Design a protein around this ligand. Structure first.
Ligand SMILES: [K+]
Ligand SMILES: [K+]
Ligand SMILES: [K+]
Ligand SMILES: [K+]
Ligand SMILES: [K+]
Ligand SMILES: [Mg+2]
Ligand SMILES: [Mg+2]
Ligand SMILES: [Mg+2]
Ligand SMILES: [Mg+2]
Ligand SMILES: [Mg+2]
Ligand SMILES: [Mg+2]
Ligand SMILES: [Mg+2]
Ligand SMILES: [Mg+2]
Ligand SMILES: [Mg+2]
Ligand SMILES: [Mg+2]
Ligand SMILES: [Mg+2]
Ligand SMILES: [Mg+2]
Ligand SMILES: [Mg+2]
Ligand SMILES: [Mg+2]
Ligand SMILES: [Mg+2]
Ligand SMILES: [Mg+2]
Ligand SMILES: [Mg+2]
Ligand SMILES: [Mg+2]
Ligand SMILES: [Mg+2]
Ligand SMILES: [Mg+2]
Ligand SMILES: [Mg+2]
Ligand SMILES: [Mg+2]
Ligand SMILES: [Mg+2]
Ligand code: NA
Ligand code: NA
Ligand SMILES: [Zn+2]
Lengths: 134, 220, 85, 52, 33, 32, 92, 89, 103
RNA sequence: AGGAGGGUAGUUCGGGGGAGAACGUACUGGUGCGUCAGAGGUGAAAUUCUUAGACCGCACCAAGACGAACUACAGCGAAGGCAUUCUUCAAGGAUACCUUCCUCAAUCAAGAACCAAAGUGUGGGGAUCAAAGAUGAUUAGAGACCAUUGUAGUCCACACUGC
RNA sequence: GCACGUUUCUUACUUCUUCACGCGAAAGCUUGGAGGUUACAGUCUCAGGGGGGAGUACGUUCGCAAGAGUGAAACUUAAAGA
């Protein structure tokens, strides 16, 4: 839908991949963060409420984004993964690897993978008691 | 349809970087009382130092630029800050040694205010056989003081463009390592992060000089 | 290494490594030096473990620097150890 | 406009020339928060917790 | 007591005022050279 | 389990039960 | 303190006067070597003493404590606003 | 504690007004009638003359202070804040 | 019956009074820092199959440039470290092996 | 005295103690732009928020707590305890000494001071977590374990308590 | 001047899974004792005397309260415990 650039010239966007233990986000923006091209989630492809974080649902979401991003005029993507974050697992969810592999195999170029998990340097108290979750 | 109202622009960096136009972006067109320039101004764009400046460890550095003027289909920017990327920082950490961190507040000659963060580690000698290389607290304080003075004096005489070149080409990093090693053996001294905390008021002439010749944009 | 130790007559090596007040008979560890500073040709006696301020009679300038342990002499000076008796 | 941000003041005029109408009870004061040089206005925190 | 206080105050303050004026003028001369 | 046989209810809760008993006796004697 | 130790030495083998009236008396007679003024001195009384010392060419030491501290530094149970030393003994 | 075990100055009230309200007013009453230190003349001679007004018996100086004590804790921090801010300019 | 000479932690007598607690990585239980089971984990972001497919598409990692990794310092409570098989019960006269380093 | 005390020195040593000024991300809540249909939570769900635009992305603002990784069979303290930087205030141990002094000592009924968390009183403050309480599940039942909330508390100043 | 390498010394927290006697019912302790004790004596001080009733009742001191210190017996049991 524009960008008036040569078909051999790479136009870069940024894809933010949020993979928790309950859902998965595939969000594509421009090189800043103030313009959004498309956003699909794992829960927009399944019905069982227990497969929202499944690797299959992540793969289906990534395929929808590629179809839409081709129309917009985006050829390549920078990658930013994150887990839940501050008071949270800090461990990436099951759908992170599937989403990135699906993007590459759908016909998109990749560059500069990075991790952007919050990681406090000193935090507030987290959920549970001093005896933990039982 | 959302894409039917969008227009494309080019983001161009100052002239102390080899690659001038390093990004593309979109914005809503002009309708009624809404003017696109009022929304484009103030955005913050991020780039990678390795892509901007050309095979070194610059692949882990990110530089941010804020938009200050709209020249047709071009966006003129200025330095906003830099950071180190977290995976690189975690890789430099080890056990059985001391980690030294310092925060330095400095100002340039054109009124910009900067805050800098440094990190360094103690190292074992080539023939050492002991189990650790922890440092005495007196030497740790001395390293912080000497590094603070060097940064303050070097930056107080430069404008924003020369100060950025000093930070992005590892001139200050090399000087700090040279003058701080005699206090205590150190490894992997880096400038972790730079924040811009003050900004002088806008000056069209100053921005024009900082950019020099501006490449043309094909959008339209 | 066949020789056996006698508690009343220790060997040179054994007694040399002992802390003072752990020897058979305790004694001092310090001595006196004959120090000549650069200029004024004057000779002054300085304690080895000196912690006070020591100046030559004429020049009225410092002659040694107190530390933890043995004092350190100024760069221009030279010294000769004095006999115990 | 001549008082640095973060200072403690009392007897503040709300109108130029009113000769003092705010923070006059026994142990009260205001706090200067910020200055706006473009419009020539100042922000204060009143003893009741409001901002003016 | 109050009369003596006023006399002492009048003389000493005026002398201090004269001292400052001479000091400032001399500083200006040194700058000039 | 980290303790040997207690021979009763948990000693913390037995202490609390006596704790409540002493209050009731104190209140009853206050009525007179 | 360095000054506190010297004052103790003067108290032992020197000559001195405590008080405003006696200090001015020694300044007029020109038998003063040093004048110590507490930080508590009223501004107009301090200005008078400093003027007298300039006329008589006598050095002034500005004490950091108040008259309560200066009085106890002389081994006294009362306050002293100014101290004038007329004869330094085995002190400095 | 010869004449009274614990009532102290509140012993003029007899057996009225309750124990805790008497205790709460005992702290403020003791300080309001005490002699405070004068930094102008170095004497313990400051006394209250109506709420907020303190006069020194030595140098005859009048100061505006707190209701029941010469200086409130809030005043000291404000003094240091202002002095630090002034020298900052 | 004293099972361990160090009582399961690393706090000799006459050394410290109190060690600050930390939250268990799994259940958020509070455990003293010297008693918890700590491991430093370095994890590849993608497995061998996915890394190969990503590298073909990327112009950066396409020619011998390492992919990023994940660094974490995980601390476990005793219950979570056993249930997750990080550690197992060991025979007597075997509980004394220490393994000061990796591997 | 290879018993006690005091002195001088390296302005030595250390998460030891008391004061100021600042710094760091994160949780929460707002503001400005973008996009559009779900988000959250679990073993599985439901209570809950959402086209009056939630979740997500960027930039910024406010307030309170907390100082990750480095961090250890390491340091300091009588014990309880103590972890960002800089500026200050008074202390403490060890070491060095051909300094001084000359039994000044050990342990202790009575007596004194300090003492984790919870708890109490009076003012501040209130972001997070969270006794009591509410709702959803699970169960034969479930006043519990799981989930969403939520008050006191959790933080500071001054007084108590002495488990 | 700052670290490292080598040899001694005083103070402190420790380890032997390639640590000796000795001691202990054993588990274990070991210059830092639980050693140097029927071959029983360096100095001072605080607690205990089968299990329960019970740290309960009564009296008294301290505390705003919650509580804290001091502290029995009548009865009942052939074991409880390491
Ligand atoms: K889910
Ligand atoms: K068991
Ligand atoms: K352990
Ligand atoms: K409270
Ligand atoms: K809860
Ligand atoms: Mg869901
Ligand atoms: Mg709960
Ligand atoms: Mg517990
Ligand atoms: Mg070391
Ligand atoms: Mg067992
Ligand atoms: Mg037992
Ligand atoms: Mg210790
Ligand atoms: Mg403890
Ligand atoms: Mg937010
Ligand atoms: Mg830290
Ligand atoms: Mg508490
Ligand atoms: Mg309250
Ligand atoms: Mg509670
Ligand atoms: Mg629960
Ligand atoms: Mg909650
Ligand atoms: Mg509190
Ligand atoms: Mg036995
Ligand atoms: Mg025994
Ligand atoms: Mg015997
Ligand atoms: Mg019995
Ligand atoms: Mg009573
Ligand atoms: Mg109460
Ligand atoms: Mg009791
Ligand atoms: Na809590
Ligand atoms: Na041993
Ligand atoms: Zn007065």
């Amino acid at each position: 839908y524009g960008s008036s650039a040569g078909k051999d010239q790479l136009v870069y966007g940024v894809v933010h991949i949020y993979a928790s233990f309950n859902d998965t986000f595939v969000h594509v923006t421009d090189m800043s963060g103030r313009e959004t091209f498309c956003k699909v989630t794992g829960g927009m492809k399944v019905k069982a409420d227990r497969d929202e974080s499944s690797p299959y649902a992540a793969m289906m979401a990534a395929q929808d984004v590629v179809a839409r991003c081709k129309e917009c005029g985006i050829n390549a993507l920078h990658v930013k993964m994150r887990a839940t974050g501050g008071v949270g697992t800090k461990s990436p969810g099951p759908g992170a690897q599937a989403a990135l592999r699906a993007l590459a195999r759908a016909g998109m170029k990749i560059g500069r993978i990075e991790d952007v998990t919050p990681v406090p340097t000193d935090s507030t108290r987290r959920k549970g008691s001093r005896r933990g979750r039982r | 349809e959302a894409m039917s109202r969008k227009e494309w622009y080019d983001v161009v960096a100052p002239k102390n970087f080899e690659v001038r136009q390093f990004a593309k972006t979109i914005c809503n067109k002009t309708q009624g009382t809404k003017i696109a320039a009022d929304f484009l101004r103030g955005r913050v764009y991020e780039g990678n130092l390795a892509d901007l400046n050309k095979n070194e460890d610059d692949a882990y550095r990110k530089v941010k630029f804020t938009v200050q003027e709209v020249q047709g289909r071009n966006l003129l920017t200025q330095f906003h800050g830099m950071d180190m990327t977290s995976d690189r920082v975690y890789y430099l950490l080890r056990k059985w040694c001391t980690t030294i961190e310092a925060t330095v507040e400095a100002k340039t000659a054109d009124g910009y205010g900067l805050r800098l963060f440094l990190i360094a580690f103690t190292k074992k000698q080539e023939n050492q056989l002991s189990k650790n290389c922890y440092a005495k607290t007196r030497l740790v304080k001395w390293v912080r003081m000497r590094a603070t003075n060097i940064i303050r004096r070097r930056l107080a005489k430069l404008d924003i463009n020369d100060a950025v070149s000093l930070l992005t080409r590892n001139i200050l990093r090399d000087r700090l390592a040279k003058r701080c090693n005699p206090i205590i053996p150190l490894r992997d001294l880096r400038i972790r992060k730079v924040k811009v905390i003050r900004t002088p008021k806008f000056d069209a002439q100053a921005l024009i000089a900082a950019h020099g010749e501006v490449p043309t944009s094909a959008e339209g | 290494g066949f020789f056996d130790s006698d508690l009343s007559y220790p060997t040179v090596r054994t007694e040399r490594m002992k802390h003072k007040r752990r020897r058979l008979v305790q004694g001092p560890n310090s001595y006196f030096m004959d120090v000549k500073c650069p200029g004024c040709k004057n000779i002054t006696v300085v304690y080895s473990h000196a912690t006070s301020e020591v100046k030559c009679n004429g020049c009225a300038t410092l002659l040694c620097r107190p530390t933890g342990g043995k004092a350190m002499l100024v760069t221009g000076c030279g010294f000769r150890k004095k006999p115990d008796h | 406009g001549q008082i640095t941000e973060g200072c403690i003041v009392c007897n503040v005029e709300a109108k130029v020339g009113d000769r003092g109408t705010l923070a006059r009870a026994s142990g009260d004061y205001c706090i200067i928060i910020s200055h706006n040089t473009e419009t020539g206005r100042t922000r204060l925190k009143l003893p009741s917790g409001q901002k003016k | 007591e109050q009369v003596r206080d006023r006399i002492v105050r009048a003389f000493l303050i005026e002398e201090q005022r004269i001292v400052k004026r001479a000091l400032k003028a001399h500083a200006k001369v040194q700058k000039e050279k | 389990g980290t303790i040997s046989r207690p021979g009763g209810m948990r000693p913390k809760w037995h202490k609390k039960r006596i704790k409540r008993l002493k209050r009731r006796r104190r209140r009853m004697r206050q009525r007179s | 303190d360095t000054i506190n130790t010297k004052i103790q030495l003067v108290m032992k083998s020197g000559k001195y006067v405590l008080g405003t009236q006696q200090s001015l008396k020694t300044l007029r007679q020109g038998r003063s070597k040093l004048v110590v003024i507490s930080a508590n001195c009223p501004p107009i009384r301090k200005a008078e003493i400093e003027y007298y010392c300039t006329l008589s060419k006598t050095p002034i030491h500005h004490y950091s404590g108040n008259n309560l501290d200066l009085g106890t530094a002389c081994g006294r149970h009362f306050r002293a606003c100014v101290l004038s030393i007329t004869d330094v003994g085995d002190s400095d | 504690a010869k004449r009274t075990v614990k009532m102290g100055v509140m012993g003029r009230y007899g057996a009225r007004y309750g124990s805790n309200p008497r205790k709460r007013a005992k702290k403020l009453e003791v300080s309001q009638h005490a002699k405070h230190f004068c930094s102008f003349c170095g004497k313990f001679a400051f006394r209250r003359k109506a709420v907020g007004i303190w006069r020194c018996d030595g140098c005859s100086k009048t100061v505006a202070g707190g209701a029941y004590t010469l200086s409130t804790p809030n005043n000291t921090t404000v003094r240091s804040t202002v002095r630090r801010l002034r020298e900052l300019k | 019956t004293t099972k361990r000479r160090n009582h399961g932690r690393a706090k000799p007598p006459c050394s410290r009074g109190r060690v600050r607690p930390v939250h268990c990585f799994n259940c958020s239980r509070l455990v003293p820092k010297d008693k918890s089971v700590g491991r430093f984990v370095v994890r590849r972001m993608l497995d061998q199959a996915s890394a190969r497919d990503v590298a073909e598409a990327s112009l950066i990692y396409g020619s011998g440039f390492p992919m990023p990794k994940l660094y974490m310092k995980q601390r476990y409570c005793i219950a979570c470290a056993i249930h997750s098989r990080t550690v197992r019960a060991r025979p007597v006269e075997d509980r004394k092996r220490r393994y000061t380093s990796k591997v």
